[PDB]
Design a protein around this nucleic acid. Sequence first.
DNA 1: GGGCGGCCGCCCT
DNA 2: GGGCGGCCGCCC
Lengths: 300, 312, 7, 7
Amino acid sequence: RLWEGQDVLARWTDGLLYLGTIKKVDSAREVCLVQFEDDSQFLVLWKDISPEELLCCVCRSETVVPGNRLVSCEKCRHAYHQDCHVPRAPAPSWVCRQCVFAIATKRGGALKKGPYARAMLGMKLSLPYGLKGLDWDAGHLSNRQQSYCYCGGPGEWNLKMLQCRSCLQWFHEACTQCLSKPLLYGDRFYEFECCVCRGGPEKVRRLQLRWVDVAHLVLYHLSVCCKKKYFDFDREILPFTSENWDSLLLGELSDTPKGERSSQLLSALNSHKDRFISGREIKKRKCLFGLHARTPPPVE
Amino acid sequence: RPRLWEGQDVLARWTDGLLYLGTIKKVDSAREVCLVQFEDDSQFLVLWKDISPAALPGEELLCCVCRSETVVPGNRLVSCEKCRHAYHQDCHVPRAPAPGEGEGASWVCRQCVFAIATKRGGALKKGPYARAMLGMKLSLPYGLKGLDWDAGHLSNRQQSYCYCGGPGEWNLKMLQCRSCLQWFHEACTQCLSKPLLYGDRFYEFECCVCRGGPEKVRRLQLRWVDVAHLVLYHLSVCCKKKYFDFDREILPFTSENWDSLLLGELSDTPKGERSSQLLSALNSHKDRFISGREIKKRKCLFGLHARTPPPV
Amino acid sequence: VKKPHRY
Amino acid sequence: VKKPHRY
DNA sequence: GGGCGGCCGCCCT
DNA sequence: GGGCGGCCGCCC
Ligand SMILES: [Zn+2]
Ligand SMILES: [Zn+2]
Ligand SMILES: [Zn+2]
Ligand SMILES: [Zn+2]
Ligand SMILES: [Zn+2]
Ligand SMILES: [Zn+2]
Ligand SMILES: [Zn+2]
Ligand SMILES: [Zn+2]
């Protein structure tokens, strides 16, 4: 089982594996308190906790049935039932699902080319959990099981995740292989389709943003990153927009004079007082703007 | 986005923890290893983690580490003043200072600091680069608690060792930290007074990460059995042969490197008692040593049963 | 500092 | 001719 | 360069 | 005559 002081790998909300130390276990709620390298402590579900062996770690048991030899991975040396693994193992060099992801996943998108890129793509054709049996909230944003993506790990929809238009499941940025630019926080202006529904490589299409969308997305992204509310337009908001203009994928708005960019953006910030709060409300300069509610920009 | 390609001039970290200029011939994406050809036209397999692209002429506009753009503000692209490579502040270990900001304008990266500070027999002890070395050594460019060691804790499958994160062999010029049980290259330490002997584990060492500052090292006391075994293994590695003549190879080595041996309590020993004590040790331990007499050779020839370092 | 684990 | 790279 | 091929030259008789 | 302690050196 699991114990205190035990060093474990924990799958974080970004789909990546981080090495941590167990500080406390709770079998009542099936949760684990894990401390990481930066001395931070977070509650981790046991499904995301990962501890020359002889047992199958998946089914907690040995079997008799022929055809499914207990195969061990080359990297993690865990013993897998040939049919408790997804999709299914060759009997005897074999790399299990979790290690294929561990090697292939990366911030800003996983590997596109290489043996492991093609390996994960084969893995991404199937899900290691019951998708149909998932419990969603009204907005279809969260799980009760906290199971998302191809990996089956935790995640927050507003923190660098894409939603498949077909199955409505959320997928980590680090687990996708279709993106050309890094995701901003709260960016839902995409038309995405996963590998499972497609039976092949993912397909993604960037939606056309309006100026009010650009202002809201940038302000929300800055708010999450800098952990504050009010941002100066000339010193913070516009420079960020200019420095990362190419990564924003703004379509037709790309060919707009920087002089008019400032005008269009400043105009949207002052007009939409349902979304934005100027510096007037807190007795600062009017060029300061912050979100009314710390929420991602809504899609039409 | 691609970081390593064929025909690329490149710096490669070797098992001594030193960097050698080379050229990639083949890129094995499956093994994450490249075939590097060095100045002596020697070709070896080098892990991707131990491979850095050579210094390009002029400025670099993309992070040499992640080779991608960041949308996270406050993560500037800083350039090393030496190799002119560009780093994201968060892509460096430890975190690289922004230009100006922390007061020295000119920032030098970890790779160049090690390149300047490291030296066979021990790194720089004094100077601005010794202190810069010390600063870098307080952080490891890898996850120590996640390495996959063997039973004896002699090698890990990631082949990550020392402060440098480079490859290495424990029995070849490496000290083991008493606290974290990690092995560290001789050329990367700054606490030694004498060059390490091959296989010499007769040390009590504690690295900078555990100490939170300068290293601490102590020379353990050797028995005469240890000295005979240590000299034999050192010669066996250095000369790459099994059997050694006592009077013309073994003994002339000890007396010519007596101070470098750091023998402590036995350092007083008169030259005559050296021979008698070494010879008796070599003869009295058939479990360690094998005489040439065993293979129809002269009795003054000695070698190790198994080419293994002295046990502690 | 946290580092994503690869083998 | 093989030797450590030095700046 | 170390594993054997080769065999001198004492001793006992 | 021939047993045997002893070790010199070729050879790939
Ligand atoms: Zn995922
Ligand atoms: Zn595995
Ligand atoms: Zn099973
Ligand atoms: Zn889908
Ligand atoms: Zn970077
Ligand atoms: Zn540098
Ligand atoms: Zn240590
Ligand atoms: Zn080193």
